[PDB]
């Protein structure tokens, strides 16, 4: 009756032990027998122990019997089972044993008959090959041992208090201290009986299952040895105990390496005169430092967190390379490691203003550890540590403007701005950067106030100071780009509120100053997105900026036009620097057309005239054509944005533009320039999407006249680009190739945008499906995404392209082998494995698999042997992999369609055909 | 009998001396977060979900993006 009480019992634990000890006091044996059966039944053992057993049967014999009458139904025991109604068990079971000892702590755990019995039974189960017995009994044995330590701790105290009772009675009758020294002796004996039991469980259980084979039983025993060393630190914080943690730090299971660090953490947060720890650190410091890159990350966090507790305790033990290694972790991808890395950095290196010293330190640190070209992740690593320092924007602002008191280098300047922007962004939008934040965590009501407070503090402070900074560093393009991001996070309501309109004028006059001076494509993209942020309909200054906006583009178009009439003349041959001129103002326009309605300038003429030259004479700078196609593309999308009240005529005029531009990019996609095809192909795959069947998919039935569908020519010219420039054979380390792949992936994404979406015929997707097991890492994720969406469009015609991919990897073989090739070579075996992975795409998956065989069979004989008894027979040990998923009724269905070509003589060099039929 | 019986209970003296001498299979290298500014953008606009639902040529103004996102289911 006791077992179910601990499982389904919401009754208090001390009540169960006391009602149990009442049964013990009444008759010891009937109480012990159910305490044993409690343990036997805590392991899930559905057997029972009798009275004749406990009278005569030995402990090894009783464990043997309970394994016979175990009567299990599965391999699960309680401690393995899942659900909260079982972790209430792990807790109730542990609290039962600790409470049991502590209540017996006085006068019963000394009868030398009960504790003796339990340990002997627990020490026995703790050696059974039966995992449920060893696991249960070992958890018990350890919880019982902690109890004994607690009991042993009270014997220590109570014995010190008597020694104080004694000497006071010596300094102040003798029969009162002779009554005391016998008390002291009785306590001495009681400690010896307790020490024995601890030894009987340590040497009996711990020294064996600490290195058990089951990982869950090693994590049990390290957690408890960490508790002993913590709670009776005087008696148990030796090396003869710490060793069993220093070794287990090397265990190959993660759950264990954690339960060592967290146990060791208990020993340093106390930080109460650690002196034995000084030796244990000496030997294992190198391992703990290594663990900050443990393969399991929970361990890595606790390894870092532990090293901070080692820093506070001594600071003398960590060399230089050790600390420097932990610093680099602030750039890690796992945020928990990063934030705890930066806790170790702040604690180690941070202790014109008070923070002026600190901000220089951060800057220098960011510059010294060249792992990151930018501070976005550096800032998030320490957003939790030093939040009042990262938001002291006055301190950074003065350090960039206020000249020295008693300097600063161009590199530290171009670093302090980077750190300043990142803090500003993470302040304004209250979430960490990509690859660090867990999800779209909703903002706390306290956080929304902390978010709107500094958002204004940023807008108020920098609206004045931003134009000054943009005036002192106007020349370094790398700097201004960072400094033309600050408006994105402004609260534009505060420019009108409070005499500040003067400062926006100083800003706009400073912005158009740098766009007159720079040509860098990244500066103008930020100038453009600035103007697009300040031209907002909600706010009180749309007008004051739209002036400068249209006022600036006037100065642009007036130039650009004049530059064309001289650059596109028949007589004069323009030159290198005359081309620099047209490119500069072209870039200046292109980047503005992307974020600003500039159809009010109708730039289609000058670009259409420019493009016509480049394809005609074939001698135009790549950067002009690239920026031409762009600027063009941006005029067609802007006109299309304004279309019924809007003049219902000029519709076909926009189609002529779209139609002739599509023909322009067709001749430019064929160019020898690699970059020029990239932008031509990109604009095509985006154009063909917009002017497509879907332009009226939802509403807008009126925008139906605009009708484009790609040529059979423009389709094969687009796919041939995917083959030559995305599926290549397999500059600056790994930071560049990932940039390259992420470009090549964006391209294969834009073409597979067309396939799913019926912009091109689906049979094109066969030259891409055949690569699914070749470029699984590189482009695999896109293939199995385009392939599974095509199956959900046309279930059957997919099977007709899946095989076309297999058909095209078959003549891809013979093209550079010959028809006599080995039909088992790892080359063939892969196509055979590609078939197995293809048939697993299959509910309506019946009419498709039929026509797939038919297109496979009708191809396997599609050419007869010009000399012999055939050709393409091998394609059937490939196709055999599809017959598994075929229906039991189609064994018939397709075999006669097979017998449409297999004669009676063939079913009499031919292995491929005999395996195909053998699948039916 | 589905009862889990372990044929080997303990780990032997030798295979613990090996664990202490070669922790190389439980440590690793640093998984750097995007190192470059652009590598952060292409991590946000990577994967199939954001790739299939965004243009190739980036569109900065929202009204231009809508034309591309109007034509998607």
């Amino acid at each position: 009756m006791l077992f179910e009480v601990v499982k389904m019992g919401k009754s208090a634990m001390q009540s169960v032990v006391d009602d149990w000890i009442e049964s013990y006091k009444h008759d010891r044996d009937i109480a012990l027998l159910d305490l044993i059966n409690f343990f036997i039944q805590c392991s899930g053992c559905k057997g029972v122990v009798t009275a004749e057993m406990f009278r005569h049967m030995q402990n090894s014999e009783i464990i043997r019997k309970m394994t016979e009458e175990f009567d299990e139904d599965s391999g699960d025991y309680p401690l393995t089972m899942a659900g909260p109604q079982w972790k209430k068990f792990k807790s109730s079971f542990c609290e039962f044993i600790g409470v049991l000892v502590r209540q017996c702590q006085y006068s019963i755990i000394y009868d030398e008959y009960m504790m003796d019995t339990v340990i002997s039974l627990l020490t026995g189960l703790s050696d059974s090959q039966v995992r449920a017995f060893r696991h249960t009994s070992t958890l018990a044995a350890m919880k019982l041992m902690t109890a004994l330590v607690n009991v042993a701790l009270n014997l220590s105290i109570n014995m010190d208090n008597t020694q104080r009772q004694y000497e006071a009675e010596r300094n102040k009758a003798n029969e009162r201290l002779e009554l005391l020294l016998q008390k002291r002796k009785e306590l001495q004996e009681n400690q010896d009986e307790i020490e024995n039991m601890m030894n009987a469980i340590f040497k009996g259980v711990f020294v064996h299952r600490y290195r058990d084979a089951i990982a869950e039983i090693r994590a049990i025993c390290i957690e408890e040895i960490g508790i002993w060393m913590k709670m009776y630190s005087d008696a148990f914080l030796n090396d003869s105990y710490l060793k069993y943690v220093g070794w287990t730090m090397h265990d190959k299971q993660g759950e264990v390496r954690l339960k060592c660090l967290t146990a060791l953490q208990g020993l340093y947060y106390n930080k109460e005169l650690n002196s034995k720890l000084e030796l244990f650190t000496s030997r294992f410091k190198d391992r703990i430092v290594s663990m900050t890159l443990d393969k399991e990350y929970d361990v890595a966090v606790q390894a870092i967190k532990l090293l901070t507790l080692v820093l506070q305790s001594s600071e003398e033990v960590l060399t230089a390379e050790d600390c420097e290694n932990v610093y680099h972790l602030v750039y890690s991808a796992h945020r928990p490691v990063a934030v705890a890395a930066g806790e170790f950095l702040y604690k180690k290196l941070f202790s014109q203003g008070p923070n002026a010293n600190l901000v220089k330190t951060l800057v220098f640190f960011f510059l010294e550890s060249e792992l990151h070209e930018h501070a976005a992740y550096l800032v998030d690593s320490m957003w939790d540590c030093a939040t009042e320092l990262l938001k002291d924007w006055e301190c950074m602002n003065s350090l960039l403007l206020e000249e020295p008191l008693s300097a600063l280098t161009d590199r530290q300047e171009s670093a302090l701005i980077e750190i300043m922007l990142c803090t500003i962004r993470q302040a304004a939008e209250c979430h960490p950067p990509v690859g660090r934040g867990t999800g779209k965590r909703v903002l706390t009501a306290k956080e929304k106030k902390t978010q709107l407070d500094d958002r204004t503090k940023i807008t108020e402070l920098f609206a004045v100071a931003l134009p000054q900074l943009l005036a002192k560093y106007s020349v370094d393009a790398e700097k201004v780009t960072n400094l033309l991001q600050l408006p994105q996070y402004f609260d534009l309501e505060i420019y009108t509120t409070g005499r500040l309109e003067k400062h926006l004028d100083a800003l706009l006059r400073q912005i158009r100053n740098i766009v007159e001076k720079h040509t860098d494509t990244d500066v103008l993209e930020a100038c453009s997105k600035t103007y697009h942020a300040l031209c907002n309909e909600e706010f009180t200054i749309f007008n004051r900026v739209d002036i400068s906006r249209s006022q600036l583009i006037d100065e642009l178009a007036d130039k650009f036009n004049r530059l064309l009439e001289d650059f596109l003349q028949e007589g004069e041959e323009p030159d290198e620097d005359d081309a620099y001129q047209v490119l500069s103002t072209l870039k200046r326009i292109t980047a503005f057309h992307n974020a600003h309605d500039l159809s009010k300038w109708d730039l289609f003429a000058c670009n259409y005239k420019l493009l016509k030259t480049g394809i005609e004479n074939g001698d135009m700078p790549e950067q002009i054509v690239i920026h031409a196609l762009q600027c063009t593309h941006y005029v067609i999308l802007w006109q299309l944005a304004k279309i019924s009240s809007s003049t219902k005529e000029d519709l076909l005029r926009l189609k002529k533009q779209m139609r002739v531009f599509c023909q322009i990019c067709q001749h430019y996609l064929t160019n020898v320039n690699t970059t020029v095809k990239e932008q031509a192909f990109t604009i095509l795959c985006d154009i063909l999407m917009i002017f497509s069947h879907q332009i009226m998919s939802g509403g807008r039935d009126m925008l139906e006249p605009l009708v484009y569908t790609p040529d059979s020519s423009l389709q094969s010219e687009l796919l041939s680009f995917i083959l030559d420039h995305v599926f290549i054979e397999q500059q600056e380390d790994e930071a560049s190739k990932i940039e390259a792949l992420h470009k090549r992936r964006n391209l294969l994404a834009a073409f597979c945008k067309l396939i799913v979406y019926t912009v091109v015929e689906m049979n094109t997707a066969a030259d891409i499906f055949k690569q699914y097991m070749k470029y699984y890492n590189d482009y695999g994720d896109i293939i199995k995404e385009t392939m599974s969406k095509t199956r959900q469009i046309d279930k059957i015609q997919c099977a007709k392209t899946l095989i076309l991919s297999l058909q095209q990897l078959f003549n891809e073989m013979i093209q550079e082998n010959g028809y006599n090739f080995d039909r088992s070579s790892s080359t063939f075996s892969g196509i055979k494995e590609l078939a197995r992975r293809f048939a697993l795409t299959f509910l309506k998956t019946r009419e498709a698999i039929a026509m797939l065989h038919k297109d496979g069979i009708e191809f396997a004989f599609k050419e007869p042997n010009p000399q012999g008894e055939p050709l393409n027979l091998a394609f059937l040990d490939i196709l055999s992999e599809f017959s598994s998923k075929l229906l039991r009724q189609d064994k018939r269905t397709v075999y006669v369609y097979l017998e449409k070509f297999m004669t009676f003589q063939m079913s009499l060099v031919w292995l491929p055909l005999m395996s195909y039929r053998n699948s039916l | 009998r589905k009862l889990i019986v372990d044929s080997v209970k303990e780990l032997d003296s030798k295979t613990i001396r090996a664990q202490l001498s070669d922790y190389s299979d439980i440590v690793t290298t640093l998984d750097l977060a995007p190192p470059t500014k652009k590598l952060m953008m292409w991590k946000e606009t990577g994967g199939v979900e954001k790739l299939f639902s965004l243009p190739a040529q980036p569109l900065w103004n929202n009204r231009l993006l809508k034309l591309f996102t109007r034509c998607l289911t």
Binding site: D239, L242, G246, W247, F280, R283 | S13, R17, L20
Partner: peptide
């Protein structure tokens, strides 16, 4: 740091 060193057994 001899207690830490594993025994031969």
């Amino acid at each position: 740091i001899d207690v830490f060193d594993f025994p031969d057994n």
